[PDB]
Amino acid sequence: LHVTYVPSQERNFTTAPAICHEGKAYFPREGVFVFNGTSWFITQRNFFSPQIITTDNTFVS
Amino acid sequence: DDMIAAYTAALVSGTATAAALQIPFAMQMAYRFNGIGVTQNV
Structure with a gap:
C-alpha cells in the first residue's frame, strides 16, 4: 500500500x-x-507560497 | 508500427513542453543543472 503526494490546482x-x-x-x-x-x-516549484525576494533567497553573479 | 511512433512522438513533445505544468526549455535545463551540482547561472 503506497501513500503518495499529488499536486493539484495549477x-x-x-x-x-x-x-x-x-x-x-x-x-x-x-x-x-x-x-x-x-x-x-520567490516560491517553490510545488505548492505556490509567496515569499518576498531578499539577498539570502538569491545568489549574485 | 505507426501506433508506436505516435507514443514516442507524444513522449518527446511532453518532455519539450513540460498534470502538465508547462515551462520554457531554458528554465528547465537550468533546473537540471541544479540536480547535477552546478549553479544555475552557469
Missing part, C-alpha cells in the same frame, strides 16, 4: 530568469521568480 504566472534590484544580476538560488501582479516573488 495557476499561471509570469516568470523571469534573473533580477537586478540595483544594476546587477540575481538568480533564484533554488527557486523561481513569479509575478503575481503586485510585485515579484
Whole structure:
C-alpha cells in the first residue's frame, strides 16, 4: 500500500530568469521568480507560497 | 508500427513542453543543472 503526494490546482504566472534590484544580476538560488501582479516573488516549484525576494533567497553573479 | 511512433512522438513533445505544468526549455535545463551540482547561472 503506497501513500503518495499529488499536486493539484495549477495557476499561471509570469516568470523571469534573473533580477537586478540595483544594476546587477540575481538568480533564484533554488527557486523561481513569479509575478503575481503586485510585485515579484520567490516560491517553490510545488505548492505556490509567496515569499518576498531578499539577498539570502538569491545568489549574485 | 505507426501506433508506436505516435507514443514516442507524444513522449518527446511532453518532455519539450513540460498534470502538465508547462515551462520554457531554458528554465528547465537550468533546473537540471541544479540536480547535477552546478549553479544555475552557469
